[PDB]
Amino acid sequence: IPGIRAQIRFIQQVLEQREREDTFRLKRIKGKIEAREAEEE
């Protein structure tokens, strides 16, 4: 029981890690597009 809880919790946290990376990257690319709307003039 506890080893399987530790494995499932570890997989949950590494998927949360992947999700934080990708929402960071999408925040960055929205910053890019707003910056490009500024860049055009």
Partner 1 sequence: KKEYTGITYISGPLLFVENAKDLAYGAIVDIKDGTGRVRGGQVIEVSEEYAVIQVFEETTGLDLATTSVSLVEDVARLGVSKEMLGRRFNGIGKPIDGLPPITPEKRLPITGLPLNPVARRKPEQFIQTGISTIDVMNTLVRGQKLPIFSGSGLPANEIAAQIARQATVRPDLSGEGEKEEPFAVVFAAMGITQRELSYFIQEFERTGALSRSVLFLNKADDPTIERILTPRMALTVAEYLAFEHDYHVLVILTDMTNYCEALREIGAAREEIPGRRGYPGYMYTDLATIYERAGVVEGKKGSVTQIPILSMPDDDRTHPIPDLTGYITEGQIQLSRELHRKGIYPPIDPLPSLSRLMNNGVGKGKTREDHKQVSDQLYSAYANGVDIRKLVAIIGEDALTENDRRYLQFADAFERFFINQGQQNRSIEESLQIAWALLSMLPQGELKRISKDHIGKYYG
Partner 2 sequence: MIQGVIQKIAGPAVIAKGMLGARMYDICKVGEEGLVGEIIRLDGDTAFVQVYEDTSGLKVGEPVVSTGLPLAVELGPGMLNGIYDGIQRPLERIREKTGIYITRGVVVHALDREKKWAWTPMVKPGDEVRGGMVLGTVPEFGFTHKILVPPDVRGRVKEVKPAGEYTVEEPVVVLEDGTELKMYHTWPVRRARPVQRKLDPNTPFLTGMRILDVLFPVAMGGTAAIPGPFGSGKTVTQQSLAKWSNADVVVYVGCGERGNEMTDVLVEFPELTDPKTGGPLMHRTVLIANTSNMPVAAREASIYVGVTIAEYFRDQGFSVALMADSTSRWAEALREISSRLEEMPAEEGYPPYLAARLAAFYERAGKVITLGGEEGAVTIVGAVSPPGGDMSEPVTQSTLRIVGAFWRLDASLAFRRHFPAINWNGSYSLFTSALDPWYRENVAEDYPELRDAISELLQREAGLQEIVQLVGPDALQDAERLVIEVGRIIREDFLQQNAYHEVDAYCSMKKAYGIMKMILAFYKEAEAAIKRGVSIDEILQLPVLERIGRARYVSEEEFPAYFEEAMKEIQGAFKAL
Find the length of the chain: 41
Site for partner 2 in 2-41 (CB under 8 A): 9, 16-17, 19-30, 32-33, 36
Site for partner 1 in 1-40 (CB under 8 A): 13, 16-17, 19-27, 29-30, 32-33
What is the secondary structure of 1-41 as a DSSP string? -HHHHHHHHHHHHHHHHHHHHHHHHHHHHHHHHHHHHHHT-
Spatial separation of the C-alpha atoms in residues 14 and 1, rounded to whole Å = 20
Q: Please choose which of partner 1, partner 2, none residue 8 contacts, taking the beta carbon within 5 to 8 angstroms, the exact cut-off set by kind.
A: none
Q: Which residues are at the interface with partner 1 (CB under 8 A)?
A: 13, 16-17, 19-27, 29-30, 32-33
